[PDB]
Design a protein around this ligand. Structure first.
Ligand SMILES: COC(=O)c1cc(O)c2cc(NC(=O)NCCCCCNC(=N)NC[C@H]3O[C@@H](n4cnc5c(N)ncnc54)[C@H](O)[C@@H]3O)ccc2c1
Ligand SMILES: COC(=O)c1cc(O)c2cc(NC(=O)NCCCCCNC(=N)NC[C@H]3O[C@@H](n4cnc5c(N)ncnc54)[C@H](O)[C@@H]3O)ccc2c1
Lengths: 335, 317
């Protein structure tokens, strides 16, 4: 454990992870707009930014009219956040505070919490439990969470990139004159027989059926933290668009910002159908391709769990049934 | 190496694989009717090229479980009479005879990181007939001072945030510079010709036929260099790359030649150093086994930029 905590401290004390997040234009613009559109809720109010990093979101809250923002950041990057806030002339309004949000002392309960807390597959090494701790300890009753909720989606996939990698061996002879098609079964076992979650970018063309929402996390609910331990998940059914080898499933998330249209709020999506983000998607490969047809029914249950060795390490239990075949299960973990 | 991904990367490196193919096939005269040992044959592809070049026999020695797939590949291609996959380390496999030629793809990042060179040298001692053919036969090491456009972009990102999002983050630049260059790691990254700040300098050569080479690697291989800069730019450090030469044809990982999966090994100074046209840079580069692990590459860099005093930086992979 203390080895892991040291690793995360070093990672977020370093520039590259913050450069990745801020260069994620879809992510950073979504937060900027979700915050600024909530000026009515934030004007003259106080904000707690959980895991403020470089402090950019806290400054977005100040530009939306917040009177006080507490930017709490555990890693050594809090010192760069202090400099950034000072450079923008905002240190009277935005107060960068080092250390974990779980032991920070604030002058006051706050009107709003903002946080970019999401990990790969939503819950791998995420900040969610810190956000929920902060909501319990520091958010006023009736206060605002930005974003307010997260939604999880699944879809069966035919991964064009995996198809290529699997067909690679049969294509050697055409380029180099050596028949290597006998490597195909071997490559399939290596590339699909493992039980690791694969974080890879997909395109809409890989999606084999209508994507299905299978879970929703309402961050304001008390006891959501207890559900995380038992597992975040749900059941799904869909019907395939057409003929293709089924390779498994893609899991992705979106988060929703309150305010604006109460039936059309602002959404930051990591769907393969939407512009790419640094989160990509979480791929769950079957042990081998399964041939499927138009209107082939696929159903099952997907549960996101902590790993036994490490509560921060995402585990996914997949139970699934492809049309006629018998129900199968596969148990995945993030590497 | 029991897994497909490294072998797929290897064969999908088109510059590498076509250069090996041609290095072998263009040596048809020297290989016709001769015997070959393929050291670490992997999937067996190079062994089959040797058969197309007219070798009368190829022993394909492979220590990892992938030898079972190479046996299948050989059989599938109709060459089981002529290409014999032998499992296990080349140090202890027993060949029926000494061979006329050795083929091997042994090179690592920075040439010698986690490479197969030691096993090629062992096989040469034990099984190559006198003056036998080595494919490739030699490796050449090159260094060039660099101004890394990607690093510049990464360092300049923070000053661009005020435009992208209305928040000034220019103060992050010194921090990013320290993070991205203050470390002592070798960085494997592909550069382009635009990054090269002076004429590349060959600083060492390795002759694979030589009996003393294995003990020489332990002491380090390298040597001095001198160059003068093309123009004004911030010097970020040096790039180290290699080529291998087949007896007559060169497989190059230069940033000035088509990209390969080896990319180049980048050696960043602690911070950028301004340089101008004809600024003189001299120094020495040594490739060494690291103390904790002889397979891990260490590079000791000594360097003098124009008037500045001579400095040292000690990198590891
Ligand atoms: C006295 O002991 C405790 O009570 C205690 C002590 C601890 O060390 C605790 C460590 C926790 N977790 C963690 O270390 N996670 C690391 C990976 C973050 C996930 C990726 N999300 C993400 N994009 N991060 C954005 C920024 O959030 C920053 N950050 C991350 N977590 C926090 C946090 N709790 N408060 C403030 N800042 C935080 C990061 O540095 C990063 O810059 C949890 C609870 C903890 C409780
Ligand atoms: C008395 O025992 C020893 O002293 C000894 C010495 C060794 O180096 C041993 C190495 C082993 N395996 C491995 O993975 N080592 C990782 C480093 C290779 C990085 C670069 N290699 C590369 N470009 N790939 C070509 C192919 O060469 C294959 N290979 C690699 N080395 C050999 C070898 N000695 N004979 C035959 N085949 C070999 C690989 O499997 C790969 O498929 C196992 C056992 C070994 C035992």
């Amino acid at each position: 454990k203390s080895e892991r905590d040291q690793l995360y401290y070093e990672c977020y004390s370093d520039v590259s992870v913050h450069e990745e997040m801020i260069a994620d234009q879809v992510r950073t613009e979504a937060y900027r707009l979700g915050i600024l559109k909530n000026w009515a809720a934030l004007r003259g109010k106080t904000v707690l930014d959980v895991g403020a990093g470089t402090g950019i979101l806290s400054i977005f809250c100040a530009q939306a009219g917040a009177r006080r923002v507490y930017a709490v950041e555990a890693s050594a990057i809090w010192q760069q956040a202090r400099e950034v806030v000072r450079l923008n002339g905002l240190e009277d309004r935005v107060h960068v505070l080092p250390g974990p949000v779980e032991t920070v002392e604030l002058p006051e309960r706050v009107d709003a919490i903002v946080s970019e807390w999401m990990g790969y597959g939503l819950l791998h090494e995420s900040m969610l439990s810190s956000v929920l701790h902060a909501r319990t300890k520091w958010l006023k009753e009736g206060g605002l969470l930005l974003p307010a909720s997260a939604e999880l989606f699944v879809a069966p996939i035919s991964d064009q990139m995996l198809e290529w990698r699997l067909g690679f061996w049969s294509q050697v002879k055409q380029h180099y004159g050596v028949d290597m098609s006998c490597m195909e079964s071997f490559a399939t076992r290596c590339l699909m027989g493992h039980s690791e979650i694969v974080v890879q970018d997909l395109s809409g063309e890989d999606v084999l059926a209508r994507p299905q929402r299978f879970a929703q996390l309402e961050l304001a609910r008390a006891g959501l933290e207890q559900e995380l331990e038992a597992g975040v998940g749900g059941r799904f059914r869909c019907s395939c668009y057409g003929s293709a080898p089924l390779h498994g499933f893609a899991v992705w998330f979106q988060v929703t910002f309150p305010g604006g249209d109460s039936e059309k709020p602002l959404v930051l999506s990591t769907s393969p159908l939407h512009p790419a983000t640094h989160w990509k998607q979480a791929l769950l490969y079957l042990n081998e391709p399964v041939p499927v047809e138009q209107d082939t029914d696929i159903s099952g249950e997907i549960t996101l769990l902590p790993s036994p060795d490490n509560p921060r390490r995402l585990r996914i239990l997949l139970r699934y049934k492809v049309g006629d075949h018998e129900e199968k299960t596969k148990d995945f973990a993030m590497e």
